[PDB]
PDB file of C-alpha atoms in Angstrom:
ATOM      1  CA  UNK M   1      -2.575  49.487 -29.463  1.00  0.00           C
ATOM      2  CA  UNK M   2      -1.393  46.634 -30.456  1.00  0.00           C
ATOM      3  CA  UNK M   3       2.066  46.176 -29.801  1.00  0.00           C
ATOM      4  CA  UNK M   4       0.368  47.180 -26.203  1.00  0.00           C
ATOM      5  CA  UNK M   5      -2.048  44.419 -26.484  1.00  0.00           C
ATOM      6  CA  UNK M   6       0.648  41.808 -27.564  1.00  0.00           C
ATOM      7  CA  UNK M   7       1.921  43.087 -24.751  1.00  0.00           C
ATOM      8  CA  UNK M   8      -0.482  42.421 -21.774  1.00  0.00           C
ATOM      9  CA  UNK M   9      -1.248  39.627 -23.949  1.00  0.00           C
ATOM     10  CA  UNK M  10       2.215  38.265 -23.530  1.00  0.00           C
ATOM     11  CA  UNK M  11       2.792  39.708 -20.443  1.00  0.00           C
ATOM     12  CA  UNK M  12      -0.569  37.388 -18.969  1.00  0.00           C
ATOM     13  CA  UNK M  13       1.474  34.481 -21.103  1.00  0.00           C
ATOM     14  CA  UNK M  14       4.096  34.407 -19.375  1.00  0.00           C
ATOM     15  CA  UNK M  15       2.678  34.381 -15.399  1.00  0.00           C
ATOM     16  CA  UNK M  16       0.441  31.568 -16.568  1.00  0.00           C
ATOM     17  CA  UNK M  17       3.198  29.708 -17.544  1.00  0.00           C
ATOM     18  CA  UNK M  18       4.934  30.170 -14.393  1.00  0.00           C
ATOM     19  CA  UNK M  19       1.970  29.588 -12.534  1.00  0.00           C
ATOM     20  CA  UNK M  20       1.260  26.307 -14.489  1.00  0.00           C
ATOM     21  CA  UNK M  21       5.144  24.737 -14.647  1.00  0.00           C
ATOM     22  CA  UNK M  22       5.387  25.284 -10.864  1.00  0.00           C
ATOM     23  CA  UNK M  23       1.708  24.016 -10.389  1.00  0.00           C
ATOM     24  CA  UNK M  24       2.276  21.044 -12.158  1.00  0.00           C
ATOM     25  CA  UNK M  25       6.152  20.123 -10.384  1.00  0.00           C
ATOM     26  CA  UNK M  26       4.157  20.477  -6.965  1.00  0.00           C
ATOM     27  CA  UNK M  27       0.934  18.273  -7.841  1.00  0.00           C
ATOM     28  CA  UNK M  28       3.342  15.502 -10.004  1.00  0.00           C
ATOM     29  CA  UNK M  29       5.048  15.641  -6.440  1.00  0.00           C
ATOM     30  CA  UNK M  30       2.706  14.757  -4.438  1.00  0.00           C
ATOM     31  CA  UNK M  31       1.322  12.441  -6.778  1.00  0.00           C
ATOM     32  CA  UNK M  32       4.218  10.408  -6.089  1.00  0.00           C
ATOM     33  CA  UNK M  33       5.381  10.784  -2.860  1.00  0.00           C
ATOM     34  CA  UNK M  34       1.530   9.421  -2.343  1.00  0.00           C
ATOM     35  CA  UNK M  35       2.729   6.602  -4.808  1.00  0.00           C
ATOM     36  CA  UNK M  36       5.334   6.009  -3.131  1.00  0.00           C
ATOM     37  CA  UNK M  37       4.243   5.794   0.525  1.00  0.00           C
ATOM     38  CA  UNK M  38       1.578   3.693  -0.361  1.00  0.00           C
ATOM     39  CA  UNK M  39       4.109   0.936  -2.363  1.00  0.00           C
ATOM     40  CA  UNK M  40       6.679   0.675   0.479  1.00  0.00           C
ATOM     41  CA  UNK M  41       3.418   0.386   2.843  1.00  0.00           C
ATOM     42  CA  UNK M  42       2.383  -3.272   0.529  1.00  0.00           C
ATOM     43  CA  UNK M  43       5.958  -4.016   0.619  1.00  0.00           C
ATOM     44  CA  UNK M  44       5.901  -3.986   4.219  1.00  0.00           C
ATOM     45  CA  UNK M  45       2.766  -6.322   4.418  1.00  0.00           C
ATOM     46  CA  UNK M  46       3.884  -8.419   2.263  1.00  0.00           C
ATOM     47  CA  UNK M  47       6.986  -9.327   4.362  1.00  0.00           C
ATOM     48  CA  UNK M  48       5.021  -9.114   7.223  1.00  0.00           C
ATOM     49  CA  UNK M  49       2.230 -11.707   5.949  1.00  0.00           C
ATOM     50  CA  UNK M  50       4.791 -13.725   5.322  1.00  0.00           C
ATOM     51  CA  UNK M  51       6.626 -13.442   8.463  1.00  0.00           C
ATOM     52  CA  UNK M  52       2.719 -14.647  10.187  1.00  0.00           C
ATOM     53  CA  UNK M  53       2.251 -17.689   7.681  1.00  0.00           C
ATOM     54  CA  UNK M  54       6.092 -19.117   9.443  1.00  0.00           C
ATOM     55  CA  UNK M  55       4.129 -18.526  13.002  1.00  0.00           C
ATOM     56  CA  UNK M  56       1.250 -19.999  11.818  1.00  0.00           C
ATOM     57  CA  UNK M  57       3.360 -23.698  10.687  1.00  0.00           C
ATOM     58  CA  UNK M  58       5.274 -23.783  13.750  1.00  0.00           C
ATOM     59  CA  UNK M  59       2.690 -22.906  15.738  1.00  0.00           C
ATOM     60  CA  UNK M  60       0.885 -25.671  13.916  1.00  0.00           C
ATOM     61  CA  UNK M  61       4.477 -28.025  14.614  1.00  0.00           C
ATOM     62  CA  UNK M  62       3.830 -27.638  17.963  1.00  0.00           C
ATOM     63  CA  UNK M  63       0.231 -28.612  17.841  1.00  0.00           C
ATOM     64  CA  UNK M  64       0.687 -31.638  16.398  1.00  0.00           C
ATOM     65  CA  UNK M  65       3.696 -33.124  18.364  1.00  0.00           C
ATOM     66  CA  UNK M  66       1.333 -32.370  21.579  1.00  0.00           C
ATOM     67  CA  UNK M  67      -1.067 -34.415  20.155  1.00  0.00           C
ATOM     68  CA  UNK M  68       1.147 -37.103  19.561  1.00  0.00           C
ATOM     69  CA  UNK M  69       2.436 -36.623  23.361  1.00  0.00           C
ATOM     70  CA  UNK M  70      -1.664 -36.328  24.240  1.00  0.00           C
ATOM     71  CA  UNK M  71      -2.492 -39.773  22.600  1.00  0.00           C
ATOM     72  CA  UNK M  72       0.759 -41.300  24.411  1.00  0.00           C
ATOM     73  CA  UNK M  73      -0.632 -39.994  27.702  1.00  0.00           C
ATOM     74  CA  UNK M  74      -3.545 -41.306  27.739  1.00  0.00           C
ATOM     75  CA  UNK M  75      -2.623 -45.472  26.287  1.00  0.00           C
ATOM     76  CA  UNK M  76       0.074 -44.200  29.444  1.00  0.00           C
ATOM     77  CA  UNK M  77      -2.685 -43.286  32.163  1.00  0.00           C
ATOM     78  CA  UNK M  78      -4.984 -47.294  31.263  1.00  0.00           C
ATOM     79  CA  UNK M  79      -1.556 -47.655  33.121  1.00  0.00           C
TER      80      UNK M  79
ATOM     81  CA  UNK V   1      10.249  43.478 -36.206  1.00  0.00           C
ATOM     82  CA  UNK V   2       9.144  44.012 -32.348  1.00  0.00           C
ATOM     83  CA  UNK V   3       5.515  43.152 -33.065  1.00  0.00           C
ATOM     84  CA  UNK V   4       6.677  40.165 -34.802  1.00  0.00           C
ATOM     85  CA  UNK V   5       8.834  39.340 -32.171  1.00  0.00           C
ATOM     86  CA  UNK V   6       5.899  39.935 -29.363  1.00  0.00           C
ATOM     87  CA  UNK V   7       3.037  38.030 -32.425  1.00  0.00           C
ATOM     88  CA  UNK V   8       6.312  35.401 -31.942  1.00  0.00           C
ATOM     89  CA  UNK V   9       6.584  34.720 -28.564  1.00  0.00           C
ATOM     90  CA  UNK V  10       2.828  35.146 -27.442  1.00  0.00           C
ATOM     91  CA  UNK V  11       1.787  32.021 -30.315  1.00  0.00           C
ATOM     92  CA  UNK V  12       4.382  29.725 -29.063  1.00  0.00           C
ATOM     93  CA  UNK V  13       3.842  29.907 -25.032  1.00  0.00           C
ATOM     94  CA  UNK V  14       0.101  29.647 -25.868  1.00  0.00           C
ATOM     95  CA  UNK V  15       0.418  26.552 -27.869  1.00  0.00           C
ATOM     96  CA  UNK V  16       3.050  25.417 -25.157  1.00  0.00           C
ATOM     97  CA  UNK V  17       0.663  25.928 -22.558  1.00  0.00           C
ATOM     98  CA  UNK V  18      -2.337  23.507 -24.171  1.00  0.00           C
ATOM     99  CA  UNK V  19       0.585  21.219 -24.501  1.00  0.00           C
ATOM    100  CA  UNK V  20       1.268  21.139 -20.752  1.00  0.00           C
ATOM    101  CA  UNK V  21      -2.754  21.420 -19.999  1.00  0.00           C
ATOM    102  CA  UNK V  22      -3.252  18.135 -22.040  1.00  0.00           C
ATOM    103  CA  UNK V  23      -0.529  16.671 -21.133  1.00  0.00           C
ATOM    104  CA  UNK V  24      -0.843  16.691 -17.356  1.00  0.00           C
ATOM    105  CA  UNK V  25      -4.124  16.302 -17.284  1.00  0.00           C
ATOM    106  CA  UNK V  26      -3.614  12.479 -18.891  1.00  0.00           C
ATOM    107  CA  UNK V  27      -1.203  11.889 -16.738  1.00  0.00           C
ATOM    108  CA  UNK V  28      -2.397  12.634 -12.994  1.00  0.00           C
ATOM    109  CA  UNK V  29      -5.096  11.140 -14.538  1.00  0.00           C
ATOM    110  CA  UNK V  30      -3.317   7.902 -14.246  1.00  0.00           C
ATOM    111  CA  UNK V  31      -1.226   8.617 -10.938  1.00  0.00           C
ATOM    112  CA  UNK V  32      -4.858   8.724  -9.803  1.00  0.00           C
ATOM    113  CA  UNK V  33      -5.242   5.148 -11.158  1.00  0.00           C
ATOM    114  CA  UNK V  34      -2.465   4.228  -9.615  1.00  0.00           C
ATOM    115  CA  UNK V  35      -3.284   5.461  -6.515  1.00  0.00           C
ATOM    116  CA  UNK V  36      -6.573   3.735  -5.944  1.00  0.00           C
ATOM    117  CA  UNK V  37      -5.760   0.362  -7.500  1.00  0.00           C
ATOM    118  CA  UNK V  38      -2.857   0.765  -5.024  1.00  0.00           C
ATOM    119  CA  UNK V  39      -4.906   1.763  -2.271  1.00  0.00           C
ATOM    120  CA  UNK V  40      -7.835  -0.680  -3.077  1.00  0.00           C
ATOM    121  CA  UNK V  41      -4.731  -3.602  -2.937  1.00  0.00           C
ATOM    122  CA  UNK V  42      -3.973  -2.415   0.160  1.00  0.00           C
ATOM    123  CA  UNK V  43      -7.223  -3.078   2.133  1.00  0.00           C
ATOM    124  CA  UNK V  44      -7.695  -6.200   0.327  1.00  0.00           C
ATOM    125  CA  UNK V  45      -4.728  -7.303   2.187  1.00  0.00           C
ATOM    126  CA  UNK V  46      -5.967  -5.976   5.444  1.00  0.00           C
ATOM    127  CA  UNK V  47      -8.714  -8.173   4.918  1.00  0.00           C
ATOM    128  CA  UNK V  48      -6.497 -11.682   4.166  1.00  0.00           C
ATOM    129  CA  UNK V  49      -4.076 -10.760   6.654  1.00  0.00           C
ATOM    130  CA  UNK V  50      -7.629 -10.895   9.454  1.00  0.00           C
ATOM    131  CA  UNK V  51      -8.527 -13.855   8.114  1.00  0.00           C
ATOM    132  CA  UNK V  52      -4.833 -15.409   8.580  1.00  0.00           C
ATOM    133  CA  UNK V  53      -5.368 -13.521  12.038  1.00  0.00           C
ATOM    134  CA  UNK V  54      -8.769 -15.902  12.826  1.00  0.00           C
ATOM    135  CA  UNK V  55      -7.452 -18.828  11.788  1.00  0.00           C
ATOM    136  CA  UNK V  56      -4.262 -18.442  13.509  1.00  0.00           C
ATOM    137  CA  UNK V  57      -6.295 -18.063  16.430  1.00  0.00           C
ATOM    138  CA  UNK V  58      -8.385 -21.060  16.234  1.00  0.00           C
ATOM    139  CA  UNK V  59      -5.161 -22.574  16.506  1.00  0.00           C
ATOM    140  CA  UNK V  60      -3.672 -21.250  19.216  1.00  0.00           C
ATOM    141  CA  UNK V  61      -6.510 -21.707  21.020  1.00  0.00           C
ATOM    142  CA  UNK V  62      -7.005 -25.471  19.930  1.00  0.00           C
ATOM    143  CA  UNK V  63      -2.948 -25.523  21.255  1.00  0.00           C
ATOM    144  CA  UNK V  64      -4.088 -24.201  24.779  1.00  0.00           C
ATOM    145  CA  UNK V  65      -6.317 -26.323  25.417  1.00  0.00           C
ATOM    146  CA  UNK V  66      -3.901 -29.571  24.496  1.00  0.00           C
ATOM    147  CA  UNK V  67      -1.653 -28.200  27.029  1.00  0.00           C
ATOM    148  CA  UNK V  68      -3.719 -27.717  29.925  1.00  0.00           C
ATOM    149  CA  UNK V  69      -5.472 -31.175  29.137  1.00  0.00           C
ATOM    150  CA  UNK V  70      -1.710 -32.413  29.038  1.00  0.00           C
ATOM    151  CA  UNK V  71      -0.920 -30.738  32.435  1.00  0.00           C
ATOM    152  CA  UNK V  72      -3.461 -32.849  33.687  1.00  0.00           C
ATOM    153  CA  UNK V  73      -2.556 -36.186  32.632  1.00  0.00           C
ATOM    154  CA  UNK V  74       0.866 -35.549  33.692  1.00  0.00           C
ATOM    155  CA  UNK V  75      -0.517 -34.601  37.124  1.00  0.00           C
ATOM    156  CA  UNK V  76      -2.845 -38.155  36.526  1.00  0.00           C
ATOM    157  CA  UNK V  77       0.582 -40.306  36.900  1.00  0.00           C
ATOM    158  CA  UNK V  78       2.479 -37.655  39.723  1.00  0.00           C
ATOM    159  CA  UNK V  79       0.268 -39.916  41.872  1.00  0.00           C
TER     160      UNK V  79
END
């Protein structure tokens, strides 16, 4: 009994051992991938945002140049 | 020594697993914290981006209105 019981105990522990190491490896992989994918988006978004700020600043610059034109075209027209 | 061998191996595995179980638990727990934090950041950024796009839209409207208005003053001069 004692020997065989220890054998059954040993069989279970090894099976659970493998299952466990296998599963933790898979889940850790997925968690990691997810975090990687998210870190990438965050990164690409920051880049996208910088490009947007620039597009805005340039539009505003064109807009402020148009203001000068407008004001002068009116002053012209009184002629 | 084949019953001392099993009691030895078994008790070894039996605690190694207790180890893994406890360790992964905390690790996964932290993985989930990160993932959530990153998703929340992506959302906050998306919102901020949204706000910026609105501001950009108002400005673009103002600039186009100016354009139009200008074309006019340049015709009210072309005769």
